[PDB]
Design an enzyme around this catalytic site. Structure first.
Site, PDB file in Angstrom:
ATOM      1  N   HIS B 356       4.036 -11.439 -25.632  1.00 45.83           N
ATOM      2  CA  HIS B 356       3.948 -10.865 -26.975  1.00 45.83           C
ATOM      3  C   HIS B 356       5.171 -11.655 -28.107  1.00 45.83           C
ATOM      4  CE1 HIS B 356       6.519  -7.965 -29.619  1.00 45.83           C
ATOM      5  NE2 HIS B 356       5.453  -7.821 -30.187  1.00 45.83           N
ATOM      6  N   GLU B 357       6.224 -11.788 -27.596  1.00 52.10           N
ATOM      7  CA  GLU B 357       7.467 -12.334 -28.660  1.00 52.10           C
ATOM      8  C   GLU B 357       6.930 -13.900 -29.115  1.00 52.10           C
ATOM      9  OE1 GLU B 357      10.269 -11.169 -30.078  1.00 52.10           O
ATOM     10  OE2 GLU B 357       9.304  -9.300 -29.678  1.00 52.10           O
ATOM     11  N   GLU B 384       3.275  -8.901 -37.090  1.00 50.39           N
ATOM     12  CA  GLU B 384       3.289  -8.288 -35.818  1.00 50.39           C
ATOM     13  C   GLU B 384       1.958  -8.205 -35.143  1.00 50.39           C
ATOM     14  OE1 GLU B 384       6.296  -8.459 -37.114  1.00 50.39           O
ATOM     15  OE2 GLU B 384       6.667  -7.433 -35.511  1.00 50.39           O
ATOM     16  N   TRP B 459       9.205  20.224 -42.073  1.00 50.66           N
ATOM     17  CA  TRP B 459       8.960  19.302 -41.070  1.00 50.66           C
ATOM     18  C   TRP B 459       8.390  19.863 -39.672  1.00 50.66           C
ATOM     19  CZ3 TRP B 459       8.600  14.111 -40.398  1.00 50.66           C
ATOM     20  CH2 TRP B 459       9.061  13.990 -38.797  1.00 50.66           C
ATOM     21  N   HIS B 487      14.801   2.453 -37.166  1.00 57.19           N
ATOM     22  CA  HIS B 487      14.226   1.965 -38.641  1.00 57.19           C
ATOM     23  C   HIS B 487      14.413   2.850 -39.790  1.00 57.19           C
ATOM     24  CE1 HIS B 487      11.425   0.082 -35.616  1.00 57.19           C
ATOM     25  NE2 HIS B 487      11.323  -0.741 -36.731  1.00 57.19           N
ATOM     26  N   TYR B 497       4.179  -1.141 -38.909  1.00 58.84           N
ATOM     27  CA  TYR B 497       3.475  -0.732 -37.587  1.00 58.84           C
ATOM     28  C   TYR B 497       2.216  -0.036 -37.922  1.00 58.84           C
ATOM     29  CZ  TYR B 497       8.130  -2.363 -35.655  1.00 58.84           C
ATOM     30  OH  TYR B 497       9.065  -3.048 -35.408  1.00 58.84           O
TER      31      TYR B 497
END
Ligand SMILES: *[C@@H]1O[C@H](CO)[C@@H](O)[C@H](O)[C@H]1NC(C)=O
Ligand SMILES: *[C@@H]1O[C@H](CO)[C@@H](O)[C@H](O)[C@H]1NC(C)=O
Ligand SMILES: *[C@@H]1O[C@H](CO)[C@@H](O)[C@H](O)[C@H]1NC(C)=O
Ligand SMILES: *[C@@H]1O[C@H](CO)[C@@H](O)[C@H](O)[C@H]1NC(C)=O
Ligand SMILES: *[C@@H]1O[C@H](CO)[C@@H](O)[C@H](O)[C@H]1NC(C)=O
Ligand SMILES: *[C@@H]1O[C@H](CO)[C@@H](O)[C@H](O)[C@H]1NC(C)=O
Lengths: 99, 596
Positions: B356-357, B384, B459, B487, B497
């Site tokens: 993946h990297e 990504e 929330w 993040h 993402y």
């Protein structure tokens, strides 16, 4: 970083082929000149390349040289190594001496 | 005597200067990741400050050039990013709070503490302590304490500090003549200057919502199915009529549902598909695992890795005293220098992580010829997504048999595929609501149309409605658990993402059709297909030089954000779930029963 090699980043006019330019003139962007003191428009063209052992193979500093071959009025140039053979005797043999 | 030539005269000099300083900064940062000492920290700070200040002066030098008459699109994008004044508006006194507050947050966030109060036995950092106490234990009483061990000992003190952060960062929008700080992150997807291809900044919110009504039905069945199997571990503790607890979805924040595969195995009597014992039998090593990855790319058609990587990078952990962090990151030093940072281990995830990297590195060199400013992807999501498409193909049973890791005779039955499909759904479908979960709260809080007192009540309530999670224990306003995420705490755009999953599936179909694959998408492969290789390389090399909207047209031909070609991948898994959930209670309303 090997900061020993510099280059002319900018020039007012294109260089004439086979010319070496050694001048301290700085690039002029607009109309305001610079009196030797670096400013927002002097734009000192000279810059030093940075070469490190970690640089990629495709970006390494390749040691490149240029060889020129042209004919001028001067005659009797110098060529590569002429190949000589072993002489023979008592045989009808073609001979090609120097000329 | 024109503005177009003046801009070019400025960008070319900056490109040569910017890369020279970037290279020094990039190489310097590597030493900090190898040997950390007291004299190393100060050395990096000295180089960082000048590099940080270098862009500040360049931005001012580009301000006087107007942007209303430069018809060249290539320089418009470069000038827009380089002209971001940023913190220059803040005064000298106000400018010093950014570094001080962020720095103390990092060290505070880096202090891992699981020591039991009134019982100081011992406690290690986050990675050795928090991960093991939840991924292996099956005790509810201690798990609840672990939940409060981080949300009541670390997040309690962040309520006054997080308060001052949001109120000032929102002010940056006015300083930059923008609507809100949330709108700043939407500028990447903004497209202007092209007739008919323009993308409005506010269209992103609607488009994301317009693509959510199709995700919910898939999530409704997934939530119904997972709760039925999760009920086994706790027979009489949770009723199968409500929602599920937050602390049983893989991670503490529920980002990844990987750990739930073992707990909800369909039929675990037969052995699972594991080749870990096979690797040790053939004596696999660090050099052999990576070399097999290299020959996978050449088969596709992409060029092989340069020789300045194998002998220049590090694979295993060096020495014993070197405790430098080895988090998976992608390094693009430029000038043909590319390195990989990670601690190699013989595990399934690490093998996939390396694959993946390394995809990110390949994408970095695609747009190398572009200037430094444009040396990046089309948008945050492209980088990504590009590095994960090959991961799907690498995990296919067909690819495994191609190399020889899997047995030559391995039947591909319905059970052998559902488990593999379920694994992808957990880490793809499961995290999709969560990614949109966090961004929606951040978008509205940055806007400023939310009074202080309604933060916590709103929330939790909307979490129970959309996400469908019951609160393990009531929490009052002073709690600041949503800010504990990595993040959000460090001011990183987590929306990237969300588009990763959508982008990955859009290209997966595009690459599969370019590969002339004849079969289901889940069984699709990209190797041994030069047609797919050239198609991918055509878009990767574009980088940021061209608008991202045109990039989509080059793979699927649709200018808009297509949403249809994402559920077709999960259509098989959806079919077997529908009949299995014939009697299960699918669809949850407001539920107070678990903690009435
Ligand atoms: C850290 O390692 C780098 C690379 O070997 C070296 O250049 C540097 O001097 C080291 N620093 C210390 C403090 O040992
Ligand atoms: C912008 O200028 C560059 C300079 O070479 C050129 O390659 C490019 O085609 C130009 N684009 C437009 C839209 O004018
Ligand atoms: C950026 O900040 C500087 C400093 O106050 C200001 O002069 C400039 O107008 C600002 N530009 C924008 C686009 O906000
Ligand atoms: C990479 O590919 C080139 C071109 O086929 C080849 O000459 C070179 O040997 C390859 N690299 C390695 C390490 O074999
Ligand atoms: C790809 O081609 C190579 C050629 O040797 C072959 O060994 C391999 O099995 C093929 N894999 C697939 C998935 O077609
Ligand atoms: C699919 O696999 C299951 C696994 O038990 C089996 O019972 C079923 O008959 C299979 N269906 C087909 C069409 O092969």
């Amino acid at each position: 970083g090997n900061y020993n090699y510099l280059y002319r980043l900018f020039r007012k006019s294109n260089l004439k082929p086979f010319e070496r330019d050694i001048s301290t003139e700085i690039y002029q962007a607009g109309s305001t000149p610079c009196n030797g003191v670096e400013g927002f428009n002097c734009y000192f063209p000279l810059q030093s390349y940075g070469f490190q052992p970690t640089n990629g193979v495709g970006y390494q500093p390749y040691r490149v040289v240029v060889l020129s071959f042209e004919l001028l009025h001067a005659p009797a140039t110098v060529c590569g190594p002429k190949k000589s053979t072993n002489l023979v005797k008592n045989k009808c043999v073609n001979f090609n001496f120097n000329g | 005597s024109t503005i177009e030539e003046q801009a070019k005269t400025f960008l070319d000099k900056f490109n040569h200067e910017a890369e020279d300083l970037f290279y020094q900064s990039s190489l310097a940062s590597w030493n900090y990741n190898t040997n950390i000492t007291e004299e190393n920290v100060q050395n990096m700070n000295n180089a960082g400050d000048k590099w940080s200040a270098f862009l500040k002066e360049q931005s001012t030098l580009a301000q006087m050039y107007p942007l209303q008459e430069i018809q060249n699109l290539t320089v418009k994008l470069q000038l827009q990013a380089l002209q971001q004044n940023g913190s220059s508006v803040l005064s000298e006194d106000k400018s010093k709070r950014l570094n001080t507050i962020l720095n103390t947050m990092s060290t505070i966030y880096s202090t891992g503490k699981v020591c039991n109060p009134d019982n100081p036995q011992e406690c290690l950092l986050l990675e050795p302590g928090l991960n093991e106490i939840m991924a292996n234990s099956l005790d509810y009483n201690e798990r609840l304490w672990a939940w409060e061990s981080w949300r009541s000992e670390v997040g309690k003190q962040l309520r006054p500090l997080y308060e001052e952060y949001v109120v000032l960062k929102n002010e940056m929008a006015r300083a930059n003549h923008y609507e809100d700080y949330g709108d700043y992150w939407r500028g990447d997807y903004e497209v202007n200057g092209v007739d008919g291809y323009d993308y409005s900044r506010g269209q992103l919110i609607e488009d994301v919502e317009h693509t959510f009504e199709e995700i919910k039905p898939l999530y409704e069945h997934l939530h119904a199915y997972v709760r039925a199997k999760l009920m086994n571990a706790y027979p009489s503790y949770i009723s199968p009529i409500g929602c599920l607890p937050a602390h049983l979805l893989g991670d503490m924040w529920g980002r990844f549902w990987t750990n739930l595969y073992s707990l909800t195995v369909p039929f675990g009597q037969k052995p699972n598909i594991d080749v870990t014992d096979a690797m040790v039998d053939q004596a696999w090593d660090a050099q052999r695992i990576f070399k097999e990855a290299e020959k996978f790319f050449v088969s596709v058609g992409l060029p092989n890795m340069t020789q300045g990587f194998w002998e220049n990078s590090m694979l295993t952990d060096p020495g014993n005293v070197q405790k430098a962090v080895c988090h998976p990151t992608a390094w693009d030093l430029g000038k043909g220098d590319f390195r990989i940072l990670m601690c190699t281990k013989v595990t399934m995830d690490d093998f996939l992580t390396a694959h993946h990297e390394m995809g990110h590195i390949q994408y970095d060199m695609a747009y190398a010829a572009q200037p430094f400013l444009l040396r990046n992807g089309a948008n945050e999501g492209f980088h990504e997504a590009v590095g994960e498409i090959m991961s799907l193909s690498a995990a296919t049973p067909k690819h495994l048999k191609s190399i020889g890791l899997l047995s030559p005779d391995f039947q591909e039955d319905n059970e052998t595929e559902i488990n593999f499909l379920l694994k992808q759904a957990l880490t793809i479908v499961g995290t999709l609501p969560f990614t949109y979960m966090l961004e929606k709260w951040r978008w509205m809080v940055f806007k400023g149309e939310i009074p202080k007192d309604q933060w916590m009540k709103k929330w939790w309530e909307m979490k129970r409605e959309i996400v469908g999670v019951v609160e393990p224990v009531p929490h009052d306003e002073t709690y600041c658990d949503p800010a504990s995420l990595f993040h959000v705490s460090n001011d990183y755009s987590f929306i990237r993402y969300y588009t990763r999953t959508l982008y990955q599936f859009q290209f997966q179909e595009a690459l599969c059709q370019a590969a002339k694959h004849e079969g289901p998408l889940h069984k699709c492969d990209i190797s041994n297909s030069t047609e797919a290789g050239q198609k991918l390389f055509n878009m990767l090399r574009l980088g940021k030089s061209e608008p991202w909207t045109l990039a989509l047209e080059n793979v699927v031909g649709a200018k808009n954000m297509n949403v249809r070609p994402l559920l077709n991948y999960f259509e098989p898994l959806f079919t077997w779930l529908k009949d299995q959930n014939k009697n299960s209670f699918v669809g949850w309303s407001t539920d107070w029963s678990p903690y009435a």
